[PDB]
Design an enzyme around this catalytic site. Structure first.
Site, mmCIF file in Angstrom:
data_model
loop_
_atom_site.group_PDB
_atom_site.id
_atom_site.type_symbol
_atom_site.label_atom_id
_atom_site.label_comp_id
_atom_site.label_asym_id
_atom_site.label_seq_id
_atom_site.Cartn_x
_atom_site.Cartn_y
_atom_site.Cartn_z
ATOM 1 N N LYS A 45 0.757 -1.252 0.000
ATOM 2 C CA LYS A 45 0.000 0.000 0.000
ATOM 3 C C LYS A 45 0.789 1.304 0.000
ATOM 4 O O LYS A 45 0.287 2.338 0.438
ATOM 5 C CB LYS A 45 -0.991 -0.001 1.173
ATOM 6 C CG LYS A 45 -1.800 -1.293 1.301
ATOM 7 C CD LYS A 45 -2.436 -1.721 -0.027
ATOM 8 C CE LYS A 45 -3.384 -0.678 -0.600
ATOM 9 N NZ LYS A 45 -4.695 -0.596 0.123
ATOM 10 N N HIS A 105 6.900 -7.061 -3.115
ATOM 11 C CA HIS A 105 6.775 -6.364 -1.841
ATOM 12 C C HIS A 105 7.808 -6.954 -0.888
ATOM 13 O O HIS A 105 7.780 -6.691 0.305
ATOM 14 C CB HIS A 105 5.391 -6.560 -1.209
ATOM 15 C CG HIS A 105 4.263 -5.939 -1.972
ATOM 16 N ND1 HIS A 105 4.269 -4.619 -2.378
ATOM 17 C CD2 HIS A 105 3.048 -6.430 -2.312
ATOM 18 C CE1 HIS A 105 3.104 -4.325 -2.927
ATOM 19 N NE2 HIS A 105 2.343 -5.408 -2.900
ATOM 20 N N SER A 135 -4.127 2.495 4.754
ATOM 21 C CA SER A 135 -4.390 1.855 3.478
ATOM 22 C C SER A 135 -4.315 0.333 3.542
ATOM 23 O O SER A 135 -5.079 -0.362 2.867
ATOM 24 C CB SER A 135 -3.411 2.385 2.423
ATOM 25 O OG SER A 135 -3.695 1.848 1.145
HETATM 26 N N1 LIG Z 1 -2.041 7.737 -9.256
HETATM 27 C C1 LIG Z 1 -2.143 7.688 -7.927
HETATM 28 N N2 LIG Z 1 -2.111 8.897 -7.232
HETATM 29 C C2 LIG Z 1 -2.215 8.909 -5.867
HETATM 30 N N3 LIG Z 1 -2.358 7.805 -5.076
HETATM 31 C C3 LIG Z 1 -2.385 6.636 -5.791
HETATM 32 C C4 LIG Z 1 -2.286 6.462 -7.186
HETATM 33 N N4 LIG Z 1 -2.350 5.133 -7.537
HETATM 34 C C5 LIG Z 1 -2.492 4.527 -6.409
HETATM 35 N N5 LIG Z 1 -2.527 5.338 -5.317
HETATM 36 C C6 LIG Z 1 -2.696 4.928 -3.927
HETATM 37 O O1 LIG Z 1 -1.809 3.893 -3.584
HETATM 38 C C7 LIG Z 1 -2.442 3.010 -2.625
HETATM 39 C C8 LIG Z 1 -2.426 1.593 -3.169
HETATM 40 O O2 LIG Z 1 -1.108 1.112 -2.993
HETATM 41 P P1 LIG Z 1 -0.437 -0.074 -3.795
HETATM 42 O O3 LIG Z 1 -0.490 0.227 -5.247
HETATM 43 O O4 LIG Z 1 0.858 -0.284 -3.398
HETATM 44 O O5 LIG Z 1 -1.234 -1.424 -3.427
HETATM 45 S S1 LIG Z 1 -0.583 -2.931 -3.489
HETATM 46 O O6 LIG Z 1 0.251 -3.078 -2.336
HETATM 47 O O7 LIG Z 1 0.148 -3.024 -4.725
HETATM 48 O O8 LIG Z 1 -1.720 -3.803 -3.482
HETATM 49 C C9 LIG Z 1 -3.825 3.594 -2.389
HETATM 50 O O9 LIG Z 1 -3.708 4.415 -1.239
HETATM 51 P P2 LIG Z 1 -4.922 4.923 -0.333
HETATM 52 O O10 LIG Z 1 -5.895 5.755 -1.103
HETATM 53 O O11 LIG Z 1 -4.320 5.735 0.743
HETATM 54 O O12 LIG Z 1 -5.560 3.723 0.207
HETATM 55 C C10 LIG Z 1 -4.098 4.341 -3.671
HETATM 56 O O13 LIG Z 1 -5.114 5.299 -3.656
#
Ligand SMILES: Nc1ncnc2c1ncn2[C@@H]1O[C@H](COP(=O)(O)OS(=O)(=O)O)[C@@H](OP(=O)(O)O)[C@H]1O
Ligand SMILES: Nc1ncnc2c1ncn2[C@@H]1O[C@H](COP(=O)(O)OS(=O)(=O)O)[C@@H](OP(=O)(O)O)[C@H]1O
Lengths: 288, 287
Positions: A45, A105, A135
């Protein structure tokens, strides 16, 4: 219940891990990397999907039509991920033509030895612990394979003790921080992508040895914004059935901001977490 | 839906939001006849009313714990404006009382029956910090019949900041009583002071009530009115009330200062503190 909590997990080399992945772990450790493999590593996350899409675009010269040819989890295989009759990360990668982009990860100590032996380029993305905790908490509630995370305070306790998939966030970021001192491992911050995406995109283009044109930068900045990726079925994981990822409860592209921890941590939990954080991190030069 | 719930449960009287059951017969409260020796205990909801009430009762009984158990506290100390048709009636309880009467109320100074002012009755006002009050008031909403669903704590706190809860604005309530507290016959106390140094406040109360302080009397009051003892005392923990009225599955919840830290998020605390300063900057009252 504690018993039920760990029933979904199993430790591999000291870190709690999804039972399904552990089943085929030998395949992960024996993974054969190639010289031009590009690894994107993150603690759960921390923004993996965001930096993955940026990198993909740099590889495809910003061709959106090429980044939609398939869903993100197929374009960029999840290395250690495997679920019988559903997905097989190692396989997707073995059958993929170079240059391959690998999602993981894993802490650096558990990354398949081949990646280190071939001195592959690695991009690590870090995010502040509190926002990661929030998250990750929703990920537990949304994705099948997770036990009940308990109340938020209860989950945060698990988080501080590293009793969650992939282990201690603290050990994870501290180890990768050391690896990041090498010019071969680019250490990035989610907060930096948020504050000035253009600066980070340009840095990634140079790290990946590509030409930083305005046209490329413009398309990346637009295509990878939260609003666009949230509605892009190729990147928002909405193609996955609800038994695997139920986004009706909470969407994968949840909020995409920095500071959501302020909406979840009570002042008491914040105080407790901050004290523990300092004892875990005061010796590392890593800073937000 | 929440607003409709609030509309069904509360109604204004003299501009102050109030429980509907208490408003139907407000005239009975408005025309209430005080007696010169009446002692009023006024507080905003959940500020520690029960605590000071028992302390005062002990002072009246020369510290005779047995005399303080002869009946439940809500019968020993009638709740002035409490009314529910013929099932509950504070005014009636007070009228039939053969004095000296101790009166409980949560009314702001402006709504206190004129008779109390006219007869110049002594009044003890107990104040508690707003954040802890909000937490305790939130639980009250959930356990006591006659309240709308308070929703989440953040939602409830917004209604609290706007004074959209029974008895209205906590800010105006404590500020108005603070001014009244400048009078020699109105003793202004703080819940936090009772927590910090109970002996000091008890001695202060004894002198205010013109009684003679003694180590033995003070000592008895102190342990008898301690949170742990009052929580287990059926006369003071409201457990004799049916779950239909008060569902304790408890009134004597925690009894500490600072429980707000276990409920306010950083964001809610920031918003609340900002709004608080705007409301309280023009007052010498300090918590
Ligand atoms: N483009 C963009 N801009 C801003 N924030 C973004 C973007 N893409 C992914 N996110 C945020 O990243 C969080 C998901 O994390 P991961 O991609 O690592 O998830 S995973 O571990 O691969 O399953 C998740 O965080 P939270 O909203 O805080 O839950 C997503 O909203
Ligand atoms: N002896 C003693 N010591 C410490 N704290 C005490 C005591 N008696 C009552 N309390 C606390 O006061 C809160 C209830 O407030 P009220 O008595 O005013 O309730 S009411 O408005 O009259 O219904 C309620 O606060 P919270 O625990 O914070 O909910 C009680 O625990």
């Amino acid at each position: 219940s504690e018993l039920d909590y760990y029933e979904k997990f199993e430790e591999v080399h000291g870190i709690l891990m999804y039972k399904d992945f552990v089943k085929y772990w030998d395949n992960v450790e024996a993974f054969q990397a190639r010289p031009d493999d590009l690894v994107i590593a993150t603690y759960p996350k921390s923004g993996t999907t965001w930096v993955s899409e940026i990198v993909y675009m740099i590889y495809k010269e910003g061709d959106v039509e090429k980044c939609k040819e398939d869903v993100i989890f197929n374009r960029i295989p999840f290395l250690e991920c495997r679920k019988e009759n559903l997905m097989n990360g190692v396989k997707q990668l073995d059958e993929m033509n170079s240059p391959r982009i690998v999602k993981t990860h894993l802490p650096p100590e558990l990354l398949p030895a081949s990646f280190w032996e071939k001195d592959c380029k690695i991009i690590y993305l870090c995010r502040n612990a509190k926002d990661v905790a929030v998250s990750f908490y929703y990920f537990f509630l949304m994705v099948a394979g997770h036990p009940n995370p308990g109340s938020f305070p209860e989950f945060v306790e698990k988080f501080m003790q590293g009793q969650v998939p992939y282990g201690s966030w603290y050990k994870h970021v501290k180890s990768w921080w050391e690896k990041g001192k090498s010019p071969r491992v680019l250490f990035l911050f989610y907060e930096d992508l948020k504050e000035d995406i253009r600066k980070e995109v340009i840095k990634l283009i140079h790290f990946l040895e590509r030409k930083p044109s305005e046209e490329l930068v413009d398309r990346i900045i637009h295509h990878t914004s939260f609003q666009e990726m949230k509605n892009n079925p190729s990147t928002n994981y909405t193609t996955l059935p609800d038994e695997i990822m139920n986004q009706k409860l909470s969407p994968f592209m949840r909020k995409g901001i920095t500071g959501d921890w302020k909406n979840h941590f009570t002042e008491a939990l914040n105080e407790k977490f901050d004290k523990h954080y300092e004892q875990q991190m005061k010796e590392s030069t890593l800073k937000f």
